[PDB]
Amino acid sequence: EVQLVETGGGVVQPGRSLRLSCTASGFTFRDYWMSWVRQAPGKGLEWVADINPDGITRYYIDAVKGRFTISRDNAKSSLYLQMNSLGAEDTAVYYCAREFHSGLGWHFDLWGRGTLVTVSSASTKGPSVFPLAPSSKGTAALGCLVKDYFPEPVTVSWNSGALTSGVHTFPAVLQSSGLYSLSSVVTVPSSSLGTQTYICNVNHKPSNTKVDKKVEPK
Amino acid sequence: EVQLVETGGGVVQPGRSLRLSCTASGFTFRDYWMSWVRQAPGKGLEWVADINPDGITRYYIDAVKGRFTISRDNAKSSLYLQMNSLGAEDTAVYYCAREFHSGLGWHFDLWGRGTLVTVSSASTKGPSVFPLAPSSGGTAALGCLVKDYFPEPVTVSWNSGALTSGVHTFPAVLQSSGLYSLSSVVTVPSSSLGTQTYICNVNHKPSNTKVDKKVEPKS
Amino acid sequence: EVQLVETGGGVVQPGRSLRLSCTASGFTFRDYWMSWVRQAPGKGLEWVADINPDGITRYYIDAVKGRFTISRDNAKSSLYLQMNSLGAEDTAVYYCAREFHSGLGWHFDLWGRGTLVTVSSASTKGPSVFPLAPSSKSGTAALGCLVKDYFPEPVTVSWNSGALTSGVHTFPAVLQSSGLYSLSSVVTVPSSSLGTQTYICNVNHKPSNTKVDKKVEPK
Amino acid sequence: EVQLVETGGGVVQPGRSLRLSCTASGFTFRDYWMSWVRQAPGKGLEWVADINPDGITRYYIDAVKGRFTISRDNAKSSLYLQMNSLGAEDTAVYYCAREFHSGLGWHFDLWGRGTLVTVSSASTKGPSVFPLAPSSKGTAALGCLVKDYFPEPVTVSWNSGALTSGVHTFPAVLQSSGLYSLSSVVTVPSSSLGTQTYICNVNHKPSNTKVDKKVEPKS
Amino acid sequence: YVLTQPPSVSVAPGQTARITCGGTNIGDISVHWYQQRPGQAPLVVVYDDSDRPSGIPERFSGSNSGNTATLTISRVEAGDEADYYCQVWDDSINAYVFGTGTKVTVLRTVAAPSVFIFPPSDSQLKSGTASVVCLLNNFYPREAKVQWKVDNALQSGNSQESVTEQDSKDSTYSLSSTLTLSKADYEKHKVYACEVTHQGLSSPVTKSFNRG
Amino acid sequence: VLTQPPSVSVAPGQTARITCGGTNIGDISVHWYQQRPGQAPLVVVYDDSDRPSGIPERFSGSNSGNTATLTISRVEAGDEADYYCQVWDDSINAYVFGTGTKVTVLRTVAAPSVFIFPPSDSQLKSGTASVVCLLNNFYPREAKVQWKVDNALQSGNSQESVTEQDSKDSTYSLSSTLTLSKADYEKHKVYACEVTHQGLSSPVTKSFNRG
Amino acid sequence: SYVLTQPPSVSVAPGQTARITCGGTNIGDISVHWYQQRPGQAPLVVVYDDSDRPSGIPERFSGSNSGNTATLTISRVEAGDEADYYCQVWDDSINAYVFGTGTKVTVLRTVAAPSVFIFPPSDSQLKSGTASVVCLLNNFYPREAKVQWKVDNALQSGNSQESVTEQDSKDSTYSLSSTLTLSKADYEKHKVYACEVTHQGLSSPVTKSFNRG
Amino acid sequence: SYVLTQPPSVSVAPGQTARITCGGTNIGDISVHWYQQRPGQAPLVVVYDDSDRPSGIPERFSGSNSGNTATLTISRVEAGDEADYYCQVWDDSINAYVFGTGTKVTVLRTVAAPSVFIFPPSDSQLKSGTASVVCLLNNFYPREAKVQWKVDNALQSGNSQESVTEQDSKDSTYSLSSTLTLSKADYEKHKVYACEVTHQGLSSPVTKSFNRG
Amino acid sequence: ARTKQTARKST
Amino acid sequence: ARTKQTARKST
């Protein structure tokens, strides 16, 4: 199957280095121009660099001049991005993208899922999970506060996947502490409160932290 | 004159209840099967329920079964729909309809205008009415802007129904606010400006808003 | 419905005779004084003659004394004007009119449409009808019918059997150098209706028993 | 000379009636059995009815039983077909045909050119003519699209008959719209194009519509 | 008896019109008034000096004194455009007497005409006569200039005009001008144009056709 | 389930055919309704091919195999509507409607009349300015209106509404509404809508000056 | 109602002999007649009473009737012989004239490749809101052809009509039009319009196409 | 570096047509491409080379480019079209791919009022020395709202964060969390905590509140 | 019965 | 000078 798989992402301290790899499969890799495109959280698309099939012609944006170096191993069907002297402006999801040309113009016709690069001095920390308890007052709302974790991402499920209707898991906000925080809410019948058990399942892979949390009234 | 009139439509909150009435006149009401037929905005006709003449047999679609209850009072020549546990899927114009048997098949030979049932958590808001004033060749345009209302519908007439030719009452559009807005316009002879009076009659029943606005060129 | 209807008008040669008839309906005819009032084209009203309810008393202006004779048939609710020795001074629209006494003064409270009496040596000539077609030369278009070379007056013109009245201008007849009348009737309509709506002018010239229904098309 | 000439064909709405006539010339009409034979467009021959010389013995196919009546007027050397309750299965060219017998069998030894009968609710409409433009990128092909007309037939010529070689005028197809459509093409030297002028002449008699259309390379 | 009325009375909309009936000691007898619209029968609007029939608006009032009866129409609108006749009945000679009549004309804003031109029909050409018609639609005031140009040549002596009465709703006038040529002369020339000059137009409007 | 085509387009004076699809629907009776915009359905054909009183002969029906057909001959603007087929199922005691078919009439090209309306002083004294461009009675429906305020294109600050096809002349009408604050409206001075339509030789602009 | 079965087609090389059969149960017991019908013309009897020949009819036409088959034989075929041929009997049981389904005489000749042309919709047609795209196959043999529409490389179905001329009197070839009919809207949803022709006269399928140039 | 200007937002009712603008000086001279990006997803090309459509992309997406504006048109907008859309060019002067800032497509629907819930800090969180107070606004429309924190009637400022979900795929509504963040100390020297919601769906502002204890 | 008999054209 | 020249992808 035709796909691109970025890897090598994660947390890097300011001033330090990171190398990304992209593995292509399902197509003839040596025939194409290949690009890296990035996207800062909640922001737009920014092309970073690209390299010609033979690996001798390369272009960069000014923001990464002298810091980033792109290369390729055609035998390994692989693309690389060497990132030096990283700063917060480099924090982004990095995408591997294939270039297409057909006598008119150039666009990207294939993307990987991307790898997240976090430039921060924050230490990896699991979230503390607190219950948003149902009020004693139809529809009831309850939820879980997922607090002070680093880095992204974190997943939340309810009742191990059994409960999905009316579930809202909010996007995390970055706090001044440098830590992330979010809430996951759900609306349920006010009658189910005494009967039905509600458990939020919080998973934070960068710290290997799973938390199951029973949310009940009072 | 043979006719059916639906009443009781309006705004209703999800999970709450609503009672529709149809008043028949001009025919032997107690002799006919009566139906409720509904139409979601922009969508097609969906038969809902019906009731036999003496009010003993009732049929319902599976989606309203348990929630809806059709009844009639033949002494009053009236048909009823009791709608409980309303959801957004019940938002529609509701028609009262008389059933006819030719000896072959069954079809509807009499309808009402219908009444709109809107299932929303939102508050009712009346519209503000503003003149679209004529300018300064041979034909002129003027109108009324009917802005920021919920829910539908809004009726607009011109000079109490005396002016119908050249009139365009535009279908309501949803603004970013989630409130409706429409314009009603009419093209008139330019020579009639200043000599003929033009009044847009705006009525928004859910808010009991009624406005008669005279439209004249700006000076 | 209370009304008076005059008949018997038309062309009459000088020195010849003519009998007018008013047919009354909707009231107790035998109870009222009835008058004939005439109006020369472009001129003012002139009372001619009246007759008491019994039919016994009659009055006349000096200029018709001996020539004209007013009578009535109360069983028929009908009024008559027998006009002998007609001259050009008798050419006029003739009105049937009911007299009213308020206890103070006397005035006319009911009139007919009137019928035109033309005293001419000339022969009756019916009109020819030609379309005034609009072009696709591109909000408002004009079209009409030309009603040419007729005698005597009048000619009636309607549009779409009376369904179209707005924007219509039926011009007053002009005397052409030939001594024959001609007029145009025109109407302004939306240009977008030019190929979709049908426009027919209905021309009627009774003295020649001419009747023309003409479809006006964009050439 | 010896001939049969059918008349009375044309367009008839479903359910309606049509009467065909056939006029015989150049032979003793009263000595012969006479037939009507029909052919639906693109289909085979179907005998319809015949009548004996005296006009008293008649045969029909079952498909026209009770709907069609054949008759003759020997003094006028004429044959008739009265066609009632027409349907689409009746759309065809209708032929007048003389019958021959010589002690062995019966066959048709004389035919008219036939008259076309179209059973359709479609309105008479002239064709719209569009150019099939010569490719800019020897032998070049160009032509005319003759689109959306009713009914059949339509003739196409090129340069008023001066161009006939290499010309292919395609048979019409009946579209779902109920209208007809065809193309006329011609192959010419690529060398020309810039020099020689090419005009298709499209003529549609049922609508009295002639169209001349200049076909060009274009930009 | 002789009853003199002014021929014309001009009044702005919303204002008051006064129509007089002059007679020697007319004040000693009863005066009645009729409204007559174009092509219509008279309709009594005031009788016995100052009484109104049912259905007649209060805007109509009457007064009679000395040698002058007066019909008064307040808040005048286009529907009031008509001829008004005063009337008395002479018991001495058993005869009705009408006044000379007064046309009420309503002022309104300036309205530029819409202009339209009509070529003669083929049915008319087939008869050997050609009529070309220029239409001036719904204008004010009444004064307008229409000139015909046949192949840019001006025209004289060969056209007639007709004007409508004041319109009972918008108070405008309409005008038709008809150019009558022979089939001969018409078939020669190519350009036909009416040029309209009206106060409502900045510069003259020309409407024109050719032959195809 | 009864399947109808969403749309049928037909030239004036020609014939419209509307189909109702169903497995062996020819074995049962089909009825047809005409529904004009803002109106209740009106039966035009029932029991396959019967016409109620007052329904023109131009309406006819047929039903066979898996297809019922409503046929409208000599179509005119008055025929513009949604048409619904209908059966009654005695098995389950239930009415079943088709999905509906809109009939569109193909008339000649008509260029729109264009009009522009300034916000009223009444609306300004509330902190909002609505500017309205009116496109009147045009065909076909495709049109482009463009807002220019002191020149420069506008984006994301206007809405369009378009009428159903006119029941007499088969045209469409469109309104475009530019919505600004009193703040921004008071800044600028020139407001203009530019209209591009096939019936226009070149784009038409209507404009006004603020005050 | 008595049944006559005719072959839909009979192929014959010029100068050779064509045989058209009319089949029926004991059709030898009854009389059979034959008609020639040319495009746009009225039928003309060429053989009647099983085997008799009308005056003015060339000797090349002859008939025979025996057992369960009557045969129209056409010797030394010329170009004017390309036509439809109908057998005919009188059914004396249900009392009707009966015709066979008809047989078309086709002239055999060598394979000939089509010249292929593609025509984009004119601008004037686009004003009307419809776009007809036309593919012309000119002067080819045999008649059987495969014309496939590809809009942006998508094989089209249900939206094209074919029309074919009769065999040419001089070269015995055919010409074919295939017309792809879209609304103007559907037309401008795409960019590549290709006519693909597959024929016995071509080594590989031929494609003519346009964009919006 | 060449500049592409996109509107940040485009609103459209279901079934209607969305138009997304990409503005550049003489952008008609260069090629423009369009990408759709759904939440949590990699971008996907929907239109390339001004007007061409990739395979697998619905016909509803079409493109055009002229003068100073390229336009992505989405017709009969349905479920799944709610996304971010990016225009893209290649700047051949400074040699870089350039993207527009992006346009979010919002589905228009009727005003819907939020159900409002307030959550006091759990006891376990107070053990850690911080108190997070949460106000929930559930399933409302439009997105614009005013959530005000009142602590003992004192309007708070600078100490709350808002977070809002994407438009719901089924009912097109939003949900919003507002979180008031205090030290446990600051929390226990106050008594009344209230979130006040001002929304178009409400006739009058709604307040949910609690007392410590 | 109202059935067709042969037209007796052939024997 | 070490200036950027066009990548010559388009003209």
Q: Where are the domains of chain B?
A: 1-121, 122-219
Q: Where is the domain boundary, E108, E143, E177?
A: E108
Name every residue whose Cβ is closer than 8 Å to that of residue B109 and which is 6 or more positions away in sequence. B98, B99, B100, F43, F52
State the Cα angle at H180 between H179 and H184, rounded to 5°. Answer: 130
Domains B1-121 and B122-219 alike in fold: yes
Task: Say if residue G179 is in the same domain as residue G94.
Answer: no
Q: Alpha-carbon distance H196 to I2, whole Å?
A: 95
Question: DSSP letter at E157?
Answer: S
| Interchain proximity I9–D106, CB inside 8 Å | yes
DSSP H helices, chain E, are 122-125, 183-188
Looking at the complex, report in whole angstroms how far the Cα of residue H7 sits from the nearest Cα belonging to chain F: 7
Q: Where is the domain boundary, H81, H109, H137?
A: H109
User: CB-side exposure of F18: number of CA atoms within 13 Å?
Assistant: 38
Q: Which of residues 29-48 of H touch G (CB under 8 A)?
A: none
CA distances (Å), origin E142, targets C183, E174, E205: 19, 8, 16
3-state secondary structure of E78: helix
Fold of B122-219: Immunoglobulin-like (2.60.40)
H interface mutation test: which of G156, G182, G190, G212 has the most H CBs within 10 A?
G190
Q: Edge-to-edge strands of the sheet including G61-66?
A: G18-23, G69-74, G61-66
Contact between chain F and chain D (3 or more Cβ pairs less than 8 Å apart): yes
Q: Which of residues 161-180 of F touch C (CB under 8 A)?
A: 166, 168-171
Tokens describing residue F156? 């994301």
Q: Resolution reached, in Å?
A: 2.5
Q: Alpha-carbon distance G45 to G97, whole Å?
A: 15
Domain that holds residue E55: 1-108
Q: Where is the domain boundary, E108, E133, E156?
A: E108
Q: Which CATH number does C1-121 carry?
A: 2.60.40.10
Q: Cα-flanking dihedrals φ and ψ of residue H78, to 5°?
A: -130, -175
**Superfamily of chain region A122-218:** Immunoglobulins (2.60.40.10)
| Interchain proximity E131–C148, CB inside 8 Å | yes
Neighbours of chain C (3+ CB pairs under 8 A): B, E, F
- Considering only CB atoms, which chain F residues are within 8 Å of B50? 95
H21–chain F Cβ distance below 8 A for any pair = yes
Task: Say if residue G94 is in the same domain as residue G132.
Answer: no
Task: Say if residue F18 is in the same domain as residue F102.
Answer: yes
Looking at the complex, report in whole angstroms how far the Cα of residue E16 sits from the nearest Cα belonging to chain C: 24
Q: Which residue in J has a C-alpha nearest to residue A58's C-alpha?
A: J7
Q: What is the CA radius of gyration of chain H?
A: 23
A interface mutation test: which of H46, H87, H119 has the most A CBs within 10 A?
H119
3-state secondary structure of D109: strand
Question: DSSP letter at F153?
Answer: B
Looking at the complex, report in whole angstroms how far the Cα of residue B187 sits from the nearest Cα belonging to chain C: 9
C188-218 as b/e: b if 16+ CB within 10 A:
bbbbbbbbbeebbbbbbbebbebebebebee
- Considering only CB atoms, which chain G residues are within 8 Å of H52? 191
Q: Alpha-carbon distance A154 to A172, whole Å?
A: 9
Task: Say if residue H124 is in the same domain as residue H212.
Answer: yes
Closest CA to A105 of G156, C41, H51: H51
Contact between chain E and chain G (3 or more Cβ pairs less than 8 Å apart): no
Task: Say if residue F102 is in the same domain as residue F193.
Answer: no
Q: Which of residues 95-134 of E touch B (CB under 8 A)?
A: 108-109, 111-112, 114
3-state secondary structure of B214: strand
Task: Say if residue E119 is in the same domain as residue E203.
Answer: yes
Q: Which of residues 69-98 of E touch B (CB under 8 A)?
A: 78
CA distances (Å), origin G49, targets D107, E111, G28, G63, G89: 8, 89, 11, 9, 10
- Considering only CB atoms, which chain G residues are within 8 Å of I3? none
- Considering only CB atoms, which chain D residues are within 8 Å of I6? none
Across the strands, what pairs with D152?
Answer: none
Closest CA to B170 of H190, D68, C139, F172: F172
Count of structural domains, chain G: 2
CB-nearest partner of C146 from E31, E83, E133: E133
- Considering only CB atoms, which chain D residues are within 8 Å of I7? 59
| Interchain proximity J10–A59, CB inside 8 Å | no
D139–chain G Cβ distance below 8 A for any pair = yes
| Interchain proximity E169–B195, CB inside 8 Å | yes
- Chains G and I form CB pairs within 8 A to the count of 15
CB B15 within 8 A of CB B31: no
- Calculate the CA F64 to chain-centre distance: 31
Closest CA to A177 of A127, A116, A102: A127
- Considering only CB atoms, which chain D residues are within 8 Å of F10? 177
Task: Say if residue H36 is in the same domain as residue H117.
Answer: no
CB D197 within 8 A of CB D188: no
Task: Say if residue F91 is in the same domain as residue F152.
Answer: no
Neighbours of chain B (3+ CB pairs under 8 A): C, E, F, H
Task: Say if residue G8 is in the same domain as residue G100.
Answer: yes
CA distances (Å), origin D135, targets D142, D189, G117, G124, G209: 8, 12, 8, 17, 11
CB-nearest partner of A105 from H49, H115, H163: H49
C160–chain F Cβ distance below 8 A for any pair = no
Q: Alpha-carbon distance C101 to E32, whole Å?
A: 12
CB D50 within 8 A of CB D35: yes
Looking at the complex, report in whole angstroms how far the Cα of residue C138 sits from the nearest Cα belonging to chain E: 11
The CATH number of whichever domain residue G120 belongs to comes to 2.60.40.10
| Interchain proximity E111–B137, CB inside 8 Å | no
- Considering only CB atoms, which chain H residues are within 8 Å of A170? 163-165, 175, 177
- Considering only CB atoms, which chain C residues are within 8 Å of B192? none
Q: Which residue in F has a C-alpha nearest to residue G123's C-alpha?
A: F198
CB H180 within 8 A of CB H193: yes
3-state secondary structure of F11: coil
Q: Which position has the token pair 């109106």?
A: F39
- Considering only CB atoms, which chain G residues are within 8 Å of F198? 127
CB C184 within 8 A of CB E162: yes
- Whether omega before D153 lies within 30 degrees of 0, making that bond cis, reads yes
Neighbours of chain I (3+ CB pairs under 8 A): D, G
Strand ranges (E), chain A: 3-7, 10-12, 18-25, 34-39, 45-51, 58-60, 68-73, 78-83, 92-101, 106-111, 115-119, 128-132, 139-149, 155-158, 167-169, 173-174, 180-189, 199-204, 209-214
Task: Say if residue F127 is in the same domain as residue F103.
Answer: no
Looking at the complex, report in whole angstroms how far the Cα of residue F32 sits from the nearest Cα belonging to chain H: 26
Q: Which residue in E has a C-alpha nearest to residue C175's C-alpha?
A: E160
Task: Say if residue G77 is in the same domain as residue G119.
Answer: no
Task: Say if residue E95 is in the same domain as residue E134.
Answer: no
Question: DSSP letter at B159?
Answer: G
Q: Alpha-carbon distance C176 to C178, whole Å?
A: 5
Closest CA to B80 of B118, B48, B39, B46: B48
CB G7 within 8 A of CB G103: yes
F7–chain D Cβ distance below 8 A for any pair = no
Question: DSSP letter at C179?
Answer: S
| Interchain proximity B177–H142, CB inside 8 Å | yes
| Interchain proximity H93–J6, CB inside 8 Å | yes
3-state secondary structure of H156: coil
Q: Cα-flanking dihedrals φ and ψ of residue E145, to 5°?
A: -115, 120
Q: Alpha-carbon distance F14 to F34, whole Å?
A: 18
- Considering only CB atoms, which chain H residues are within 8 Å of F153? 23, 69
Tokens describing residue H160? 């709350």
CB G166 within 8 A of CB G83: no
- Considering only CB atoms, which chain C residues are within 8 Å of E162? 171-174, 183-184
CB C118 within 8 A of CB C10: yes
A105–chain J Cβ distance below 8 A for any pair = yes
Paired sense of beta strands B78-83 and G61-66, if any: unpaired
Closest CA to D86 of D121, D60, D119, D117: D119
Looking at the complex, report in whole angstroms how far the Cα of residue C184 sits from the nearest Cα belonging to chain E: 8
